[PDB]
RNA sequence: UUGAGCCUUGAUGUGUAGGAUAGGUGGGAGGCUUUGAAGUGUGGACGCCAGUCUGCAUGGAGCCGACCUUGAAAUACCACC
């Protein structure tokens with residue numbers, strides 16, 4: 001096991017985040033995708049967090 | 051010599067009453083001079099932060115007793131308004147480089163809310179001694195009638211030093227000690243009103259009173 | 271009592287592999303304290319500096335500065351603008367005062383205008399009447415005219431592209447300093463400075479209070495200023511009070527004791543393994559508790575991450591008598607003459623150390639030798655047997671988005687050094703880049719590791735006229751001595767440019783000393799023989815320092 | 823015997839160019855100098871090494887301010903220093 005849990009914090013300022021596993025060794029670059037934010041009800045960009 | 055001898059008279063350890071300090075200081079009337087007053091207010095405030103510096107101007111009630119030339123720079127017929135009101139010097143907007151080209155011994159700031167022609171070199175030609183005026187002090191306005199009397203009154207600025215230590219002229223010994231105490235109260239209230247946006251502890255850490263050739267005494 | 275500027279409490283740090291470069295470092299700092307941080311390339315010194323300056327908060331534990339202290343952080347490789355000039359780069363540092371003057375002149379324009387004269391002023395100018403006072407925006411001109419003298423900055427018209435390596439660090443130092451800060455955190459502040467600048471900086475640092483945490487591999491630099499030493503060996507923080515000479519013996523003692531304890535633990539593990547493997551002897555116990563104790567005894571310990579050893583240098587084509595002579599060389603940039611009427615001839619099988627001030631043409635010489643430039647007079651005459659291999663002065667030529675192995679080899683399972691091929695993995699492993707440490711991206715590399723990798727990548731041409739431009743950039747003591755012993759065995763010719771004369775004292779056989787007016791003089795021998803020459807034809811002149819200072 | 827703190831007494835602060843070791847505001851102004859000079863040996867710490875502070879030698883009545891050629895000016899109290 002080398003994949004460790006990360007959470008994709010939102011970018012609308014609300015408190016909402018997904019969680020996933022990311023190989024921090026071979027992918028030092030941070031993730032950012034477009035995911036659904038059910039608080040504001042819109043497809044916003046989710047940035048990488050702790 | 052005499053300063054070392056009167057070191058016995060001075061009691062710098064003990065802080066002293068507002069009027070007891072003047073009682074001590076007036077016994078030094080043996081100096082061969084006018085013996086002016088050289089108060090030093092010592093506030094508690096950190097000078098490095100910009101917001102914690104104060105530079106105002108207040109009109110002392112009983113005056114200073116010493117006068118200097120007042121120079122007013124007007125863009126147009128502004129430099130002649132004091133010529134009919136007692137202004138020491140009038141400078142024209144077309145005479146910005148010739149306002150004090152020969153002599154600069156004119157300790158009066160320039161107030162002209164309409165003529166903004168002459169300022170001076172931007173590089174301590176009129177910015178090192180404070181020749182650049184602004185309405186924050188109080189002189190920035192197009193009404194010179196008030197400033198004509200304010201120059202004779204001697205509205206003293208609050209020159210904030212490297213650690214909040216300010217001096218002024220407070221009605222030299224020839225003025226009565228009651229007038230001196232009135233000046234003290236009027237300056238203390240003014241600076242208390244002047245207190246900056248951030249303050250801690252006690253604002254006024256100390257006050258000392260002295261003479262150009264006369265030793266210093268606490269004020270409390 | 272009182273004091274206590276900065277604190278760290280149980281400040282761990284975990285890297286993607288798994289190890290903890292920092293774990294359980296709890297310590298505090300005091301006003302007017304100088305700390306020198308030691309360690310090896312990979313110990314975590316630069317990460318600790320970043321944490322202490324507060325760049326990264328991905329720690330476990332706490333890291334607090336006392337409020338109202340200004341922190342000046344000098345990183346490993348400061349990044350500037352290749353478009354800017356020295357004037358517009360330094361002018362950025364004092365930013366609240368340039369805008370203060372500009373806005374004050376604009377308000378001097380707008381105040382006589384009768385439009386909102388009592389609204390546009392009392393709210394806006396008042397916020398500046400003290401920004402021009404506390405920071406003193408009026409006298410920045412004389413402040414800069416004085417502060418330029420001490421560092422002896424390049425000319426104002428100079429461009430960053432035209433700027434040389436040492437002058438770039440000088441400019442960055444001025445920019446960082448001008449804030450007048452209390453905490454001064456520097457990571458290898460003297461990478462490119464010469465004797466004059468280094469002595470000046472290590473006098474100013476000792477004078478300047480507010481606590482200074484400095485990363486340094488230089489014993490002599492550290493000794494003058496450091497009052498405390500932080501070790502930072504293998505995820506532990508060892509504080510030592512003394513000097514470098516006293517601390518080195520304690521470090522050696524610690525290593526010896528750890529090795530002895532390692533051997534004792536090994537022997538115990540053998541002895542218990544024999545009992546574990548013995549029989550049963552009837553219907554008796556065999557001691558499940560003893561088994562559990564033995565199983566617990568099988569722990570792990572970290573070998574010192576890089577006790578790097580002698581590097582690899584593959585020699586190439588045989589070289590004859592002609593070693594690229596130079597005749598009547600003259601160089602200039604506009605009117606600024608660097609070298610005039612230079613003529614010499616390197617012998618065969620020699621090492622030539624080049625010494626001189628900053629921006630005196632040392633890199634320019636390699637530039638014109640490698641064909642990048644042209645000589646304004648004379649000619650350099652290469653030998654036809656000569657193979658060229660010149661190391662760039664700057665690490666900033668790799669691509670940070672590539673792995674170590676890919677960057678060095680080129681994505682080939684077998685590459686070639688010189689003429690014989692040998693596998694790329696082995697070629698990199700010869701530079702102490704083990705299989706595990708193979709996988710880190712070259713953007714995720716310490717200064718010393720980056721230097722080692724860049725050297726390894728460039729030295730694969732298999733040439734024999736090695737033009738090294740400061741290989742001693744970010745090298746530890748052992749890393750330096752590995753290359754220092756490998757170079758003495760080089761068959762081909764080696765031309766080396768450096769500022770630390772102690773490295774050259776062991777390897778240099780010919781000397782190129784720069785001087786004023788653009789005077790470059792050749793010499794045959796080592797530095798002790800150079801001193802002998804000076805003493806035989808001497809001159810009484812020792813009045814080097816003047817201590818210009820910064821503030822009036 | 824000593825660590826540390828506090829309060830008072832002293833001393834120290836040499837970028838360039840005005841004059842030559844000058845930290846900040848002074849408050850404004852010639853007063854200091856005579857409990858005995860600018861001057862004549864040197865006491866000694868330090869120095870960037872030109873010297874400026876200072877023990878003692880007779881007499882013992884002297885310097886600058888102001889002008890400013892540089893951003894700033896004149897050690898000629900006292901202030902948190």
Ligand SMILES: Nc1ncnc2c1ncn2[C@@H]1O[C@H](COP(=O)(O)OP(=O)(O)OP(=O)(O)O)[C@@H](O)[C@H]1O
Pocket residue numbers: 024025028285286287291309310311312313314315316317318346457485710714715716717718719744
């Ligand atoms: N993503 C990563 N994967 C693996 N190792 C990493 C990663 N990021 C950093 N590291 C390692 O963490 C360590 C960081 O060390 P740091 O940057 O403090 O330099 P140093 O060698 O301690 O000091 P200096 O280079 O200044 O002499 C290095 O050993 C580096 O290889």
Ligand SMILES: Nc1ncnc2c1ncn2[C@@H]1O[C@H](COP(=O)(O)OP(=O)(O)OP(=O)(O)O)[C@@H](O)[C@H]1O
Pocket residue numbers: 428431432433434435436437462603608627628629630631632633634635
């Ligand atoms: N293209 C250029 N235009 C103008 N000046 C230049 C140019 N290239 C170099 N210079 C100048 O030539 C001088 C020598 O630069 P060089 O690169 O040789 O430095 P160096 O002596 O090796 O210094 P360092 O100690 O930084 O390594 C410097 O004054 C630099 O500003």
Ligand code: NA
Pocket residue numbers: 315316346457716717718
């Ligand atoms: Na580093």
Ligand code: NA
Pocket residue numbers: 434435436629632633634663
């Ligand atoms: Na160079």
